[PDB]
From a paper:
Here, we report the complete structure of a bimodular ∼760 kDa BoNT/A large progenitor toxin complex (L-PTC), which is composed of BoNT and four non-toxic bacterial proteins. We found that L-PTC/A consists of two structurally and functionally independent sub-complexes, the M-PTC and the HA complex. The HA complex is composed of HA70, HA17, and HA33 in a 3∶3∶6 stoichiometry and adopts an extended three-blade architecture, whereas the M-PTC is situated on top of the HA complex platform. BoNT/A absorption is mainly mediated by nine glycan-binding sites on the HA complex that together form multivalent interactions with host carbohydrate receptors on intestinal epithelial cells.
We next separated the HA complex into two major components: the central hub composed of homo-trimeric HA70 and the blade composed of HA70D3–HA17–HA33. Their crystal structures were determined at 2.9 Å and 3.7 Å, respectively. Specifically, homo-trimeric HA70 forms the core of the complex with each C-terminal HA70D3 domain binding to one HA17, which in turn simultaneously coordinates two HA33s. Each HA adopts an almost identical conformation in the independently solved structures, despite differences in crystal packing, suggesting that they represent physiologically relevant conformations. The 12-subunit HA complex is stabilized by numerous protein–protein interactions that include interactions among the HA70s of the central trimer, between HA70 and HA17, between HA17 and the two HA33 molecules, and between the two HA33s in each blade. The N-terminal domain of HA33 is fixed in the HA complex through extensive inter-HA33 and HA17–HA33 interactions, but its C-terminal domain is largely unrestricted.
Author numbering:
A (entry chain C): 8 to 146
B (entry chain D), C (entry chain B): 9 to 294
D (entry chain A): 380 to 434, 454 to 626
Amino acid sequence: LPNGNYNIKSIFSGSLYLNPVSKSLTFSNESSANNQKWNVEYMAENRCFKISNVAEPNKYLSYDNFGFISLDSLSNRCYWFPIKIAVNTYIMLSLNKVNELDYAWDIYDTNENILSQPLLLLPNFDIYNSNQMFKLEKI
Amino acid sequence: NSLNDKIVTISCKADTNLFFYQVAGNVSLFQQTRNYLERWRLIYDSNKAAYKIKSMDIHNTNLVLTWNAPTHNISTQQDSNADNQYWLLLKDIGNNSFIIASYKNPNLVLYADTVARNLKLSTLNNSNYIKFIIEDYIISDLNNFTCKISPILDLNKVVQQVDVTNLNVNLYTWDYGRNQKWTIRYNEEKAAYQFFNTILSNGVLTWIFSNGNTVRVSSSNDQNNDAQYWLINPVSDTDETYTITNLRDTTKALDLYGGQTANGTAIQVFNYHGDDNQKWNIRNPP
Amino acid sequence: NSLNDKIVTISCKADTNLFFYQVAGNVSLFQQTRNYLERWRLIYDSNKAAYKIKSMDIHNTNLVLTWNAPTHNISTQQDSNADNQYWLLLKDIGNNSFIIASYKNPNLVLYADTVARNLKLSTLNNSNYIKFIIEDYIISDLNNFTCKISPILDLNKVVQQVDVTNLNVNLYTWDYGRNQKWTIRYNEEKAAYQFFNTILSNGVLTWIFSNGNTVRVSSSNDQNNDAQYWLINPVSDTDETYTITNLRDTTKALDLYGGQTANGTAIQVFNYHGDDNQKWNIRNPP
Amino acid sequence: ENIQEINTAISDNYTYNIPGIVNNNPFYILFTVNTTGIYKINAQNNLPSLKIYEAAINYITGFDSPNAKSYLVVLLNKDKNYYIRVPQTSSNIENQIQFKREEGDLRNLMNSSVNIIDNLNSTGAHYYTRQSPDVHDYISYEFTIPGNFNNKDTSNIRLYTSYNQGIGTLFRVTETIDGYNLINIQQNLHLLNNTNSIRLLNGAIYILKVEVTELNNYNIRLHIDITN
């Protein structure tokens, strides 16, 4: 996964884009703004990726003590371990085991509708959970 | 078809002195008010198997507990019957507490932020911060309430025990005496209340069916007497007014002898009639 | 603790014909067997406020439902009282079903894969795949069970209705007729059962209390007669033997007249003493 | 045919730049590995395809089809020598040969060339002709099912051979920062005139590893017919 700026999308929708809304992360209508742009940087020492918001470049995708993905300053919670499962489809694990499991970005859907859902961090067991699949589109 | 349409208070297992409190669209956690600001009607939708939680606010009558998805915030918004306004009420058996999960995303449940005094969300875990006590508002208001009890025919009079040794019960003018105050206790098992007189450690208001129609207080370490127990029913469209019916014989309401607003008038039971010497004001002693 | 030590079956809200079934450490979803392979003892720990779900397997006596962390798989493993062997039983009120959450990680709950016919852990959603029916195993076994009923004094004879027009109930040699078969139905509200004779549509075993100790079949569109309803209590050490007591007066037990075993012998009610003529085998019709 | 040499024994990672002045001729690279292990070897964009030889000199794997994309996955012993035949770059852009030690699932692919298939844009018939490995030797194919991926949309894939009999193993491919992950989804697939279809996810990547069990033709021709 090359370094650079990406849009981030759920496989449930090709027209909804990851952005912060208050302290949550959600997928929204295309804005063409910096807040839908994500700077992916590989970290050689731990073989993971940190992912910062272009609009707020000192804030990274992280997670809180409540099960939500968040946008925070750098910490070991900001390291993501992706599993590429298709062209530019990924499962995004936290680098750290959480509650001694793999945990992954997870977006809840109601009949494939994700509007207004917050992105959460939930257990991962395999590569087939649709709610854990995300598109990284270079742009 | 058990909680549906019930008006309840909701308090925190992590802090039983904090209740869900609503003012102008804002939901917080606040001490007990015994008024509509902390009352909620549970409105069941049978096809969703989930509930709307609706504020009994007398000014804005259409506000329901709402998750402001995708944020961490909970507020009250106009009822639009939206998924973010429905909640699964999951009773944790053995614990007698509830988890309250969002219908819109059942992985997320209410979390009591007791330091911030407001509501948040969390995935499920074992902490007390996601457990809640849901109680019929009358029980909630009266349980462990220390009150004074007045006939509506003379508010300045009061049901009293006579003294620490004379365990008889008569009417007398309010003088703030401990013999004139009652700590109400709800017994979840018998689904009824007892009135503990505060001049005794274990003296409770007891219908002495033996001498027919009369009422004294006596020891509460007599264990299985269902005349030591009472039912309290709100007189319709009041705030403080109730009927008090005895457990052993629910036709037998607590009665002010003859309607006589006078000192020393006997307190007894009589057959129910909805008639004014059988209505009572239960209030905080000023 | 109202569930502590209870023996239950657990079936799928998604497919009520599928039950949790255990053999040699494997948990699967299987059709009803009415035997120990589908029975589980709920074991409460008050400190954790969570339950072990212990298989009633007769050979391996210490197997409990276990989450195979970090995978999403479930199995039965030896009981070591581990957090991954404890479960929160969360009753979804109004839906009469349970969500069963891992105590080790309540983010995850049991999910029924009805096409692989096994269980896994899953995050929450609003589907019936995460909802289960937990039922006392006797109610589970007998509810909607079409049976024949025999006195233990002679298992070759059955309690029968005489014929379609003759509503009397007597003892006769088993001949496979529908007047000799009964469909048991549990009434949720009454917490009691009826026995519908299969030769009729709405005819139930009834104590004719206005005629002393007589029992006959009569119609079940007589609606509030407790005399139409029965308690069915297992006899210890036995798989098929029950005492059957009348809901109107539980001291009245289904009774074989005299303990006589001849064809035609009366079936009646009598004061309960637990003699052999008040014990009944409820069995599959061969 | 100028033989060049990587004098230093390579380990884990190595990149060798084609001079460019040797592109007008088939040319060889002599090398050895620091430690015995399974290596992925390829040109810059898997182009051109490479051949590898053991040094007696013995052909191991690889072929020579012009404009055919491929990479080699081979078990290399630190005791022996190895030759890489690079074919004619009839286009004077400078190429690079990449050597990488594989510690993960790609080890399932030794020893074989993996053909990059990139013309599966639709339903219908497709086939691919390469020089056939001898009996018990392997040839692999990495392809992507046409369509957009949604973990639901799916196509019927008929995989078969024309003349040679072969046993196929089908893998599902995912990728992390550490290279490929492989899920072995099918085994023992008899390819010669196989009439069984397989439903595979649209937009997903798969690898078919084929073991030649009967050499009836100098070439092996793999058919991937797609229906919906």
